[PDB]
Design an enzyme around this catalytic site. Structure first.
Site, PDB file in Angstrom:
ATOM      1  N   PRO A 167     -11.052  31.481  -7.361  1.00 35.96           N
ATOM      2  CA  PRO A 167     -10.950  31.996  -5.996  1.00 35.96           C
ATOM      3  C   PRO A 167     -11.945  33.113  -5.691  1.00 35.96           C
ATOM      4  O   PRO A 167     -12.330  33.889  -6.580  1.00 35.96           O
ATOM      5  CB  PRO A 167      -9.561  32.622  -6.005  1.00 35.96           C
ATOM      6  N   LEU A 168     -12.306  33.221  -4.410  1.00 37.83           N
ATOM      7  CA  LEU A 168     -13.074  34.343  -3.890  1.00 37.83           C
ATOM      8  C   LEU A 168     -12.150  35.227  -3.044  1.00 37.83           C
ATOM      9  O   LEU A 168     -11.512  34.764  -2.094  1.00 37.83           O
ATOM     10  CB  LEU A 168     -14.240  33.826  -3.048  1.00 37.83           C
ATOM     11  N   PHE A 201      -9.569  33.088  -0.769  1.00 32.91           N
ATOM     12  CA  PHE A 201     -10.122  31.775  -0.545  1.00 32.91           C
ATOM     13  C   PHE A 201     -10.083  30.992  -1.867  1.00 32.91           C
ATOM     14  O   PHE A 201     -10.780  31.327  -2.837  1.00 32.91           O
ATOM     15  CB  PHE A 201     -11.566  31.885  -0.031  1.00 32.91           C
ATOM     16  N   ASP A 252     -12.779  34.634 -14.263  1.00 30.33           N
ATOM     17  CA  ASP A 252     -12.849  33.921 -12.975  1.00 30.33           C
ATOM     18  C   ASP A 252     -12.550  34.945 -11.884  1.00 30.33           C
ATOM     19  O   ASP A 252     -11.515  34.891 -11.229  1.00 30.33           O
ATOM     20  CB  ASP A 252     -11.804  32.820 -12.970  1.00 30.33           C
TER      21      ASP A 252
END
Lengths: 131, 131, 131
Positions: free
Chosen positions: C1-2, C71, C37
């Site tokens: 995810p961002l 996101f 991540d």
């Protein structure tokens, strides 16, 4: 909905807040959301950091572009969206943002994609009603 | 499409513009969108305010990270999206942006989710053709 | 995810960094994503540029609001998301963010909508495992 508004630093703080109030008023009017359902992030940029051309439609914007990015749950019709765009732009004209200078985008998610506070998902827990 | 470019403030205004030009040229090339379909918000941050690691893929980045978030209407194939990634990164290499330092996300919506100006939904009204 | 984290400038750089650490740890815990991540953009604003009222739920926030916009790939269940909302919020309390000043939103895409570097789509090529 969560609204990201990106505009340019040449506009005064007073007009930035007028812009945000207008955008919120429009959404309340057209979507019929609670008046306190207001979640906005306003970011001012140097004019050169916003580049918004005319998509080949043959018009010119000033450098004072205002980009309005609406993140909101799905469910609203095409026509309701057209009315959102219209009301936002009409609300902005009398406070000094020209129609040529407004760019609007909508990005959708689900009711279960929201938390308004306290680590709770209020649409899922029913603490907030779904439109 | 609406492109959010988040990069670091140590990059000069000229390199910032070059990066934006390169992303734009890449999307035109691969997506065959109109040349003037250019909508970009560049936001400069202190390097410490962007954190982009490697997801455990086994590589390192410099602090001069460039994050590219493409909001575009749905309809492009997986393969076309890969061509987009490749093109954006290749275009940025000669501008002083290493492959290691690029990160790209795509988020989709529909044609009726756009207003390019004047409070109108140009794809819905037919004033603009939907590719 | 961002993750886009938008907060206010009164908070120190130390706390900003602790907030970002907290959000990331929560996401690792609940989602079981790799520890590296991590992709976050932290943006500080004048308090007056973030407006987050109570959606008519009957509480007050301090002006020091924290908005967290995730996101991420689709697939996570309703309950996983509820768990994310809670883990995040409880991770932030001890570092000085009251549960009334946290707002979180999730916006989804697919695995083929990501490029972690080098112009490649790593979930598509197989280099990165789908969560």
């Amino acid at each position: 909905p969560l609204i990201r508004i990106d505009l340019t630093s040449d506009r005064s703080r007073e007009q930035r807040r007028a812009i945000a109030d207008a955008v919120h008023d429009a959404l309340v009017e057209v979507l019929a959301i609670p008046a306190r359902d207001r979640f906005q992030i306003l970011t001012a940029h140097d004019p050169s950091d916003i580049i918004a051309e005319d998509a080949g439609l043959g018009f010119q914007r000033s450098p004072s572009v205002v980009i309005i990015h609406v993140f909101t749950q799905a469910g609203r019709t095409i026509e309701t969206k057209q009315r959102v765009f219209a009301a936002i732009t009409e609300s902005l004209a009398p406070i000094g943002v020209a129609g040529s200078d407004v760019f609007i985008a909508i990005t959708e998610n689900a009711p279960h994609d929201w938390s308004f506070g306290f680590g709770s998902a209020q649409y899922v827990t029913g603490e907030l009603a779904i439109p």
